[PDB]
Amino acid sequence: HHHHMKDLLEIDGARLWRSLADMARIGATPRGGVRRLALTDDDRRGRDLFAQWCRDAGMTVSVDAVGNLFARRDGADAQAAPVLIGSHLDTQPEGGRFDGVYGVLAGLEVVRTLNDAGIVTDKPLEIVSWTNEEGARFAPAMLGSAVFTGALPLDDALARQDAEGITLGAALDACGCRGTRAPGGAVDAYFEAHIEQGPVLEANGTTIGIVTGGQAIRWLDVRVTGVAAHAGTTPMPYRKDAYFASAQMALELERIVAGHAPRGLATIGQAGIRNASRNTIAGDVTFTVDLRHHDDAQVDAMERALRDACARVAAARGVQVAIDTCWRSPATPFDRGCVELVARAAEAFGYTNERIVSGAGHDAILLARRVPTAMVFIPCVEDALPDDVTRGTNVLLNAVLARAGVATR
Amino acid sequence: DLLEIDGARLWRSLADMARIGATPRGGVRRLALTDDDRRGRDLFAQWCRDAGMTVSVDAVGNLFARRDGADAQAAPVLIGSHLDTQPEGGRFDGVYGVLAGLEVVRTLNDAGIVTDKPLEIVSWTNEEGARFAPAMLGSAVFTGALPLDDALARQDAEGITLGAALDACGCRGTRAPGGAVDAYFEAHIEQGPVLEANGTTIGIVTGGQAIRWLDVRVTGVAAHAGTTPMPYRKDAYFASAQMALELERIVAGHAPRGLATIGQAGIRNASRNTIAGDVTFTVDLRHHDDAQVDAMERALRDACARVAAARGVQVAIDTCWRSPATPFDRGCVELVARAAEAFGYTNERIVSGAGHDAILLARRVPTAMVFIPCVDAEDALPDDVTRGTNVLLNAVLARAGVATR
Ligand SMILES: [Zn+2]
Ligand SMILES: [Zn+2]
Ligand SMILES: [Zn+2]
Ligand SMILES: [Zn+2]
Predict the structure, then answer these.
(1) In terms of residue numbers, what domain contains B300?
(2) Does any CB of chain A come closer than 8 Å to the CB of residue B209?
(3) Does the CB of B96 have a partner CB in chain A at under 8 Å?
(4) Same domain for B262 and B291?
């Protein structure tokens, strides 16, 4: 049967906050963060703590052949594919206490709440922590979910080596979490709760980010060539200054992105004058460009505008410019129907809410290309507030219940 | 009545000296007080003795060749530059002026000319400031700007002291550096494009620029490139780019004498998907006048403050080096001008854009320089080498006076 959002079934927010505090002990760093690098001893301790909690909540727990960790709560429909709630327990070298872990433990609290309420779903529920989401110890990021969706072959993943030469397969064996089951399988829908990792919801007082998808991204390398002449002997009209040229190109980029507001973004994150000295005009300048938009055609349009603009600047200043695209990633829309469940849950509770794009990668990005996917963002300051943690999980709970259905209560 | 030098002879002396320390790329490496610097010093000294001169070193290795005049009590007219080089030096920088002095003497010998005041040729120790700091070390000791004992204690990258290196070179003299000088002349390639572009043979060098070296640091917020919408950003790199264009505008308001250059710049702790939160760059500011270069600096401080306020970032501007303008002596400069006009060579007044021993000498001794053009900035044409030395000879002889001929 159908869930009623207007019943406003709520979680135990204090219980979820305590589980976050307890998990943040595992790998706690001197600065107050968390280090559980994928498949290290501290990652295993976090996986094991989570698995224990899941089994105490009546779930069965297993790992697949790349270490993806699944907890299962059967529904009344023995044949139905599960509604999957996921994120990741692994961290960066100096990770925050909410990145990744919030969405995994939100799933656990969803189950603990269903247990407390005596609710049996129609479709089964599963909670997943994906292996090596962070891409720090092993490449790539979102390794476990990429293997699950078929984007990364299993044998290629098992052979990835960390900086010490250890293979991921060897690390799975050391972890004790190499399952025998091939990764993959039918999924009805995938939901992921996560902190925003950006300032929008906190700045607006918005409790719920209704996540629409991920951006189209381009990474560019720019090199500007001039003449590296002496700073004192060369009068200004003789100069072919690659750094003043690069500076004007940066401001052209700022103007191009302003023309694509609000969805277009651009960032020059690396830049340098090569073979540089204080009293030598720059003859060789490199910088990188990160370009974003909601749409691939529009981010490509921004790129072509930048190439045109830089060509014009270079011709006016007598320098040369080369622009190479070294990485592309497509926009990744989420499923309209699953996104609508997130919105409806937020509206039923009266929580402030806004549509927002995911500005960074998540396992949800990989899942969305294969199965109906939505995300719940909460604001963050790294830190999140207890009532935002609670209310985001209330939204997750009720969107998942709407999707999975309620068989009995 | 114009005496002309032997240009082919001068050209061959430059070719022969460029063999000493020749590099695989066809340049020259004679780092100060290394074995190849010693071999260049010794070759020059031999040529000077073959030309009848006496040669000595002072207590910091400055190398002096002397041609007496008829007036035994007069201070000398000194022709100088340097034989040492950068790690990858050119075949004319420094050496041209030293070997022009030698050709001056050879031409006076050929003509049988006795001057009134004596002439000396000098190659100053460690002009380049590469192996030991500072640049112009030998001329700085000579003028008293750098104490001798401080100079001798300077260490290179391997920890060797300059005094130890003089001892290894065999060129630690016993005489305290310094002494009366009537005038100092230095010939040098321009190291810039002006004379060649203008078709000007002789640069009548007016002196040195006022220079400021600034360190700029711009601080923003290093937020994620995808999660941070544009209105939330405090982007230190876009801010620094706008400051650079403000600087370009300020210097255009001080044309033609004001110059500015950002030669070093980078985003620190940088990543492609992170907004720049910490950007540093350097500024080299020049003018003919200290008050004007100071005005450009204060204009830049005002402009950068305004940019930072508009963009929500912070900016800090520190001065790490200042050097004052250094005008040359009116009379010696005019002797260069008159020599160029006597020969009918094209000529223009020009500031020295780079440091030379002449800069140090000008603060204690009446000083002038002769610039010649650079090809297309390290090579010079044979006729320019010749004509610059003709001008040097005429100016030096006018200063030293002719006793007999
Ligand atoms: Zn993360
Ligand atoms: Zn995460
Ligand atoms: Zn030089
Ligand atoms: Zn030089």
Answers:
(1) 210-324
(2) yes
(3) no
(4) yes
